[PDB]
Design a protein around this ligand. Structure first.
Ligand SMILES: Cc1cc(NC(=O)Nc2cnn(Cc3cn4ccccc4n3)c2)no1
Lengths: 179, 177
C-alpha cells in the first residue's frame, strides 16, 4: 500500500513535470524564437542563457524517462534500476544548475517585463522564474521518493540502494559545479 | 493584483511539504504524506485587499548548499521553519537557515515558524526527547530566536490540528503589504 502510494506519486509528479516543461517551452520560449513579438535588446538571441539546456531535459523526460517509469508502475521495489539505466541523462541537470544564476540575472537586469506580459497574455499561474526552478526541484526530489520506498520495500531493495546512490550523486555533482 | 513569492525553508524535520499541503488543501494529508508540493498560487484576501500568494517548497535541497539559493532571488517573504519537537532543527535556524537567507536576501522579511505544535505535549515525543536529555522548544525560546534573527513574527502551528496554520500565511502576506 505505501510503496504503491509512493510509486503513484512518482508517476503523477513525473507527468506534471513533463506538462510543466512543455508549457514553459511552448509559451515563454516560443515567444522568443517565434518572431511574433518584440524582444528586449537586453536578451535578444540569449535564450541559450535564459532556458539553459531545458529543451534537452524535457526531451529526456518526454521521449524516454516517463515511458520507462510507467513500465515500473507494478514493480516499485525495482524502480531504482530505472535511475541506474538512465544515469548518464541526469548529467544534463549539472549543466542546467551551473547556468541557472546567469539565467536569473539576465531576466532581472535585461528582460524588464517581457515574460510577465507573456504570463498575463497566456493566463499562467507560474512565472518564467517558477518554471525555470522546476528542474532544480525535480532533480533533488527523486532521492526523497527513493528513500520513502526504502522504508517499505523488503531487501529485494538494492534495486533502490543503487538508484538512490545515483540520485544522490547527480544533485551533489550539480551542487559541487556551482561557482 | 499584488503577486507574493513566499519560500518555505528549514530542516527535513519541520515537515515543510506536509505544512504546505495541509494549508492549501485545508486538511492534514493523513493516509499518506506526499513528498511533492509543486509551486502553488492562489488568491487570498487579507485585511480586505485580495492578494496572489505564491508558495515554493524546498524539501530535497537540505543537503545542497549551492542549489538552495537558486530559489532565493526576488522572494517577498521567507518562512524559516523548525519543529517544536526537534531542538537540532531549532538550532539550525541560527546555524544554517538565517545566515544563507540573510546573505542572499538582506532586506526580505522572515516569519519564524515552529511546526508540530500538537507533539509538544505528546508523552511518547516528550519521553523520546528525555532519553536524549532534550525537551521540546517552548514559546519564549522561539520569541528569543525571532529577535536574534530579525524575524517580524514568531508563530507556532500544527499541520495536524490546523492550529495557527492559516495565521502563518496571513502574517506572511501582512509582512509584505
Ligand atoms: C508539518 C507538521 C506536522 C505536524 N504535526 C504532526 O504531523 N502530528 C502528528 C501526530 N500523529 N501523526 C502521525 C505520526 C505518528 N507519529 C509518531 C511519533 C511522532 C510523530 C508522529 N506523527 C502526525 N505539525 O506540522
Amino acid at each position: 500500500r505505501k510503496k504503491e502510494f509512493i510509486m503513484a506519486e512518482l508517476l503523477q509528479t513525473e507527468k506534471a513535470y513533463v506538462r510543466d516543461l512543455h508549457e514553459c517551452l511552448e509559451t515563454y520560449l516560443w515567444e522568443m524564437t517565434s518572431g511574433v513579438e518584440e524582444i528586449p535588446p537586453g536578451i535578444l538571441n540569449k535564450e541559450h542563457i535564459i532556458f539553459g539546456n531545458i529543451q534537452e531535459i524535457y526531451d529526456f523526460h518526454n521521449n524516454i524517462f516517463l515511458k520507462e517509469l510507467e513500465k515500473y508502475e507494478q514493480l516499485p521495489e525495482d524502480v531504482g534500476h530505472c535511475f541506474v539505466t538512465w544515469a548518464d541523462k541526469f548529467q544534463m541537470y549539472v549543466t542546467y544548475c551551473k547556468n541557472k544564476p546567469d539565467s536569473n540575472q539576465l531576466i532581472l537586469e535585461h528582460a524588464g517585463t517581457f515574460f510577465d506580459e507573456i504570463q498575463q497574455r497566456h493566463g499562467l499561474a507560474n512565472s518564467i522564474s517558477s518554471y525555470l526552478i522546476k528542474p532544480v526541484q525535480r532533480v533533488t526530489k527523486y532521492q526523497l521518493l527513493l528513500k520513502e520506498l526504502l522504508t517499505c520495500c523488503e531487501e529485494g531493495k538494492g534495486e533502490l540502494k543503487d538508484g538512490l546512490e545515483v540520485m544522490l550523486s547527480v544533485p551533489k555533482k550539480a551542487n559541487d559545479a556551482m561557482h | 493584483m499584488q503577486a507574493i513569492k513566499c519560500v518555505v525553508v528549514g530542516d527535513g524535520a519541520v515537515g515543510k511539504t506536509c505544512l504546505l499541503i495541509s494549508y492549501t488543501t485545508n486538511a492534514f494529508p493523513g493516509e499518506y504524506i506526499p513528498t511533492v508540493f509543486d509551486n502553488y498560487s492562489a488568491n487570498v484576501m487579507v485585511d480586505g485587499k485580495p492578494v496572489n500568494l505564491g508558495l515554493w517548497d524546498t524539501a530535497g535541497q537540505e543537503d545542497y548548499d549551492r542549489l538552495r539559493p537558486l530559489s532565493y532571488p526576488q522572494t517577498d517573504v521567507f518562512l524559516i521553519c523548525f519543529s517544536l519537537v526537534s531542538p537540532a532543527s531549532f538550532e539550525n535556524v541560527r546555524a544554517k537557515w538565517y545566515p544563507e537567507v540573510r546573505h542572499h536576501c538582506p532586506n526580505t522579511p522572515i516569519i519564524l515558524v515552529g511546526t508540530k505544535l500538537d507533539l509538544r505535549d505528546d508523552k511518547d515525543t516528550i519521553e523520546k526527547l528525555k532519553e536524549k536529555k532534550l525537551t521540546p522548544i517552548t514559546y519564549p525560546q522561539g520569541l528569543a530566536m525571532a529577535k536574534e534573527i530579525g524575524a517580524v513574527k514568531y508563530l507556532e502551528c500544527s499541520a495536524l490540528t490546523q492550529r495557527g496554520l492559516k495565521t502563518v500565511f496571513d502574517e506572511a502576506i501582512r509582512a509584505v503589504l
